[PDB]
Ligand binder design. Structure first.
Ligand SMILES: Nc1ncnc2c1ncn2[C@@H]1O[C@H](CSCC[C@H](N)C(=O)O)[C@@H](O)[C@H]1O
Ligand SMILES: Nc1ncnc2c1ncn2[C@@H]1O[C@H](CSCC[C@H](N)C(=O)O)[C@@H](O)[C@H]1O
Ligand SMILES: CCCCCCC[C@H](O)CC(=O)O
Ligand SMILES: CCCCCCC[C@H](O)CC(=O)O
Lengths: 356, 358
């Protein structure tokens, strides 16, 4: 009865996550810096790196490689480095291991003493042994709520609570986000080695409290309403639809720590809130290709958001009706955004956390 | 890829269809538990690592893992971390594994508060864990699977088991592949185990007289596959392509890397037993006389473990409804054939304890 979000669309995520990759780029630098200076386990104990919310692994290759290269300048070439990639049980881990084996950029192909493992258990509980993780990485994952909050009203705007006019919905989602953030920190706080570092990149509210992706939100809500208008989607199904993704303001990220600035042995060593460059807009300004613009944005939304939407359908998620819903929705959202291209705000927060 | 590999178990049914495997590995659990009493454990804050090589869905791993964990808890503090690293091929259903570990009441995660689980989706014929980190290794019903159909080996005319082939060249090719696979497995486990660590292996054996066993099963499967061709459900070309690269090993084969001085890549055979598992399906049939249940149990066993590899030979996709129909009909036919004439079968197994040099 605890309703959870759906994992990324395995078949398209690696090809539809260029936005996420561009956005996390600044956090890689922080992660690399952390790897250069973090206290290390006593030799020859393996150095453990944890990647919280891996999906298909495609976007993990760059940050993992950056950390490993930094560590190699500090340790013997034969010393083991273990990367623990974590996600939910229903993530496609076969896709992950194929990425790790097949992608030329995989750290497995660049470092003969690196190892990979997967953990398919929610990161809102402790999932790794205490005091073992030297370096933690988590990008575009903690914005996902553990659940649609208990007793929260159905979102009439469906796709994002930030754009809802229902006061009770906003508070329910915000409380769930606060609880999840506390839980995430509590358990990473146990998993990290003393002196260990954790780098988090997540969806933020900008300085003016805004979520962003406004034209995307509009195009998605309009595309969903068109399907119920066309009789393709049932009104009962649309009412059920909700994407439990939550952005956090700077005060929300500091909440567990204030006022003394420590929470469960963890402190914020660095925090940045910024707006990621809108690369799809930059490309559109350059080549004037409106269709490509629509397809870029639609693909991003499909791989990340549509499985959660498709889970509200009466039929199973493996049903041919669900595939048709996905494809039609992607095509519609593409058309709307292509017809009037605009820049979008992509607000992010990057944090470096340290353990006592 | 030109290297043709076997297929993983059918995750939809393996947990319901692996009672034969579970009953067969039972004696190896005692060996594993005993090893857990004395193996060296790594320095703080490292977790004790137990490696499970060839996990499939995890269903049959729960009892061995718990035995080891219970033994370790008689030695160390309750708050010491134990990590179980479950390994399989990349195309194993690891979602099914993590669902087993979350949902099955027998899961060690539900019985031990400081135990953890991880998955490694890389062939165990390479090194897949950090050197010297594994205190206890476990592998049941996994190393009988060849790394590949041997290069240049002739097509099997009976498809489902090389031991029943009349082709000398095919038998030699599979035997050589099995021998090199075993060397590889041992070489890389020898690196992964800590000094003084122990690895318990349970695998398909040839009995005292060189026999593979499952003879009535073999006959039913071959006959059923021929029926599908005859009935226009299977192309002759598809059947020609079918081969299950499972190999049983005699005592001499298991000892081969070690002979004559007893060591190979830092490992030695501490204990080896070869035995025939009690045929529980036969025992049940003797008790209740239910021929249909007998056929269904044997057919379900074969389906979960063997049919995915057979289905891989089809001209259609493995996601195609035709592959699903093939599997279902093959199961029904084998079930009917065995139900019609229930017979006991030999299930030859070898259980080994390997020790890494102190
Ligand atoms: N409670 C939870 N535990 C573990 N993973 C979770 C989670 N909630 C969401 N996720 C995962 O977080 C991922 C978001 S996609 C982010 C993938 C990658 N880190 C990148 O930067 O592109 C998805 O795989 C989703 O399944
Ligand atoms: N080279 C290889 N590397 C890793 N796993 C392998 C392998 N070859 C076969 N396997 C796995 O071995 C398993 C055989 S089924 C055995 C499952 C369980 N150990 C039990 O006793 O019941 C399958 O999951 C198969 O995918
Ligand atoms: C208007 C809704 C748009 C929200 C966009 C959410 C983007 C996801 O966080 C990406 C991801 O999880 O990898
Ligand atoms: C005659 C053919 C009988 C082969 C029986 C093979 C049994 C498999 O090893 C079981 C498994 O992998 O879990």
């Amino acid at each position: 009865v605890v309703v959870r979000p759906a994992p990324m669309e395995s078949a398209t995520y690696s090809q539809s996550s260029r936005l996420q990759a561009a956005g996390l780029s600044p956090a890689i630098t922080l992660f690399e810096k952390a790897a250069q200076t973090v206290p290390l386990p006593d030799a020859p104990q393996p150095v453990v790196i944890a990647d919280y919310g891996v999906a298909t692994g495609h976007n993990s290759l760059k940050p993992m490689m950056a950390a490993i290269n930094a560590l190699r300048r500090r340790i013997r070439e034969d010393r083991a480095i273990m990367v623990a990639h974590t996600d939910v049980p229903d993530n496609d881990f076969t896709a992950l291991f194929r990425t790790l084996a097949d992608d030329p950029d995989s750290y497995l192909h660049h470092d003969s003493a690196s190892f990979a493992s997967a953990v398919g258990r929610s990161f809102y509980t402790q999932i790794l042994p205490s005091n073992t993780v030297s370096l933690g990485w988590s990008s575009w994952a903690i914005a996902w709520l553990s659940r649609i909050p208990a007793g929260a009203p159905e979102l009439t705007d469906h796709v994002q609570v930030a754009y809802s006019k229902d006061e009770r919905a906003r508070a329910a989602y915000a409380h769930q986000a606060a609880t999840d953030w506390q839980d995430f920190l509590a358990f990473r706080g146990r998993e990290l080695c003393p002196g260990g570092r954790l780098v988090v990149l997540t969806m933020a509210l900008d300085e003016h409290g805004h979520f962003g992706y406004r034209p995307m939100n509009d195009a998605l809500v309009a595309a969903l309403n068109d399907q119920v208008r066309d009789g393709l989607l049932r009104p009962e199904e649309l009412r059920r639809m909700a994407i439990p993704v939550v952005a956090r303001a700077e005060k929300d990220l500091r909440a567990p720590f204030a006022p003394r600035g420590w929470f469960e042995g963890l402190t914020i060593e660095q925090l940045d809130v910024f707006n990621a460059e809108d690369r799809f807009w930059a490309a559109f300004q350059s080549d004037g290709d409106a269709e490509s613009f629509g397809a870029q944005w639609a693909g991003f939304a499909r791989a990340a958001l549509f499985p959660t939407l498709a889970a509200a359908l009466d039929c199973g998620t493996g049903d041919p009706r669900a595939t048709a819903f996905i494809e039609q929705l992607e095509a519609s959202v593409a058309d709307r955004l292509a017809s009037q291209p605009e820049p979008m705000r992509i607000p992010l927060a990057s944090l470096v956390l340290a353990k006592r």
